[PDB]
């Protein structure tokens, strides 16, 4: 069972630092070189740096050389990226990503964002989008909740605690121009079902330690 | 450095065709050590093939890999509603271990109309001096549509956000988001609140509306 588990990232000041560790399982870490990859939100994939099996030799990318270091762990099973000097351009999702060798489809970690600004965490306000007969025919009514003016990403929104699943969008945060995000998310639902389920949305803003549930009535 | 250019940049295809994406690079690539990605919008991408030709580990029949030199392709040989992505190359024989660009594919399904719902803003939003108007266009396809809002009749520009969701894996629609903001002042000085929808599938506009406060 092939698991990459990174931790380390999150908000950091411009000109600081970041310590991002990766605790790999199921294949023989060891016998592998190992990379980080990042990506700039909307942006391609940029190879960052790499590792040999043993760590002694390693390569990086132009723009981190001297700030960024590349070690390993092969005790742990892990991979370590140490991060100084940081800038916007640094800001990204990372990604610790075996040699393609490996041969493995899921072999790289689930990512952390690493956001670099000097703005600091704040949580989101939570709307309904209630249903109404605006949003309700064909025997199915739309409803949702705002996510609003929350910074920095990410957000995770489910309904009624994991247990409502189909018919969900959870719609990608836009930036506003106030420098924090807002995101919608939406829900069919049998319009027959109004009256007698309830729908609420769990909203949680780990980098604020924000946790929201709303529940969504229904209007006349 | 290996510069490895990706073609085409986008490419648009039904289940049961045959797409093929390009890596060209600027120097050979020895040892075939060449690789392609699959990343989903938001995900992690996954390894597809390695070696140049070689499947990974739960890679599906469909997906090969071909190629040697300065030429490499990655072939889906049958869509499926699921193929949906950003597909990159990679090449990890000399560092820096350079990316492509991407192909992005989208899986293209026959035309299908938006469904259309106004929101207008909670109670509990406007007690704190701003107004969030949302609009919600429901499983359609293609994804280019137009969203205008319209307050007493006059176009709006300049007050709203839209955001679209990642294909259904299963239907290959999109869903999209408009969210028209204005101070609680300016929302209180108008009554009429509207969003018109403009796309292919629909033969002529429609336009969803609320009277402010009924
Ligand atoms: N500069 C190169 C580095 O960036 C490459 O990723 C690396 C890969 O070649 C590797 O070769 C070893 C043994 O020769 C093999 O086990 C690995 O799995 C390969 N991917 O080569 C560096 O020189
Ligand atoms: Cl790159």
């Known amino acids: 069972e092939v698991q990459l588990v990174e931790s380390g990232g999150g908000l950091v000041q411009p000109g600081g630092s970041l310590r991002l560790s990766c605790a790999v399982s199921?294949?023989?870490?060891?016998?592998?070189?190992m990379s980080w990859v990042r990506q700039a939100p909307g942006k391609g994939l940029e190879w960052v740096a790499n590792?040999?099996?043993?760590?002694?030799?390693?390569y990086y990318v132009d723009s981190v050389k001297g700030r960024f270091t590349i070690s390993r762990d092969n005790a742990k099973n892990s991979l370590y990226l140490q991060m100084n000097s940081l800038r916007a351009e640094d800001t990204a999702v990372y990604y610790c990503?075996?040699?393609?060798?490996?041969?493995?489809?899921?072999?790289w970690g689930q990512g952390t964002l690493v956001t670099v600004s000097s703005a600091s965490t704040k949580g989101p306000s939570v709307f309904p989008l209630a249903p109404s007969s605006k949003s309700t025919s064909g025997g199915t009514a739309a409803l949702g909740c705002l996510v609003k003016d929350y910074f920095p990403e990410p957000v995770t929104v489910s309904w009624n605690s994991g247990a409502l699943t189909s018919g969900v969008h959870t719609f990608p945060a836009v930036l506003q121009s106030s420098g924090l995000y807002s995101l919608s998310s939406v829900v069919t639902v049998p319009s027959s079902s109004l009256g007698t389920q309830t729908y609420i949305c769990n909203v949680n803003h780990k980098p604020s330690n924000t946790k929201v549930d709303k529940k969504v009535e229904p209007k006349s | 450095e290996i510069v490895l250019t990706q073609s085409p940049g986008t490419l648009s295809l039904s289940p049961g065709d045959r797409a093929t994406h390009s890596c060209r690079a600027s120097?050979?690539?020895?040892?075939?050590?060449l690789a392609w990605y699959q990343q989903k919008p938001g995900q992690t991408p996954r390894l597809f093939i390695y070696?140049?030709?070689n499947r990974a580990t739960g890679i599906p029949d469909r997906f090969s890999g071909s190629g040697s030199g300065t030429y490499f392709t990655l072939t889906i040989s049958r869509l499926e509603p699921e193929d949906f992505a950003v597909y990159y190359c990679?090449?990890?024989?000399?560092?820096?271990?350079?990316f492509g660009q991407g192909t992005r594919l989208e899986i293209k399904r026959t035309v299908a109309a938006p469904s259309v719902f106004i929101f207008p803003p909670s109670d509990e939003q406007l007690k704190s001096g701003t107004a969030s108007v949302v609009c919600l266009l429901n499983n359609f396809y293609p994804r280019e549509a137009k969203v205008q809002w319209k307050v007493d009749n006059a176009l709006q520009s300049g007050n709203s956000q839209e955001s679209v969701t990642e294909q259904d894996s299963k239907d290959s629609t999109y869903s999209l988001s408009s969210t028209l903001t204005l101070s609680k002042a300016d929302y209180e000085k108008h009554k009429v609140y509207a969003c018109e929808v403009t796309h292919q599938g629909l033969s002529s506009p429609v336009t969803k509306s609320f009277n402010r406060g009924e």
């Open positions: 990503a075996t040699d393609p060798d490996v041969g493995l489809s899921d072999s």
């Open positions: 199921g294949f023989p870490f060891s016998s592998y070189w």
């Open positions: 590792i040999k099996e043993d760590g002694s030799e390693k």
């Open positions: 120097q050979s690539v020895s040892r075939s050590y």
């Open positions: 070696g140049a030709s």
């Open positions: 990679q090449q990890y024989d000399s560092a820096p271990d350079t």
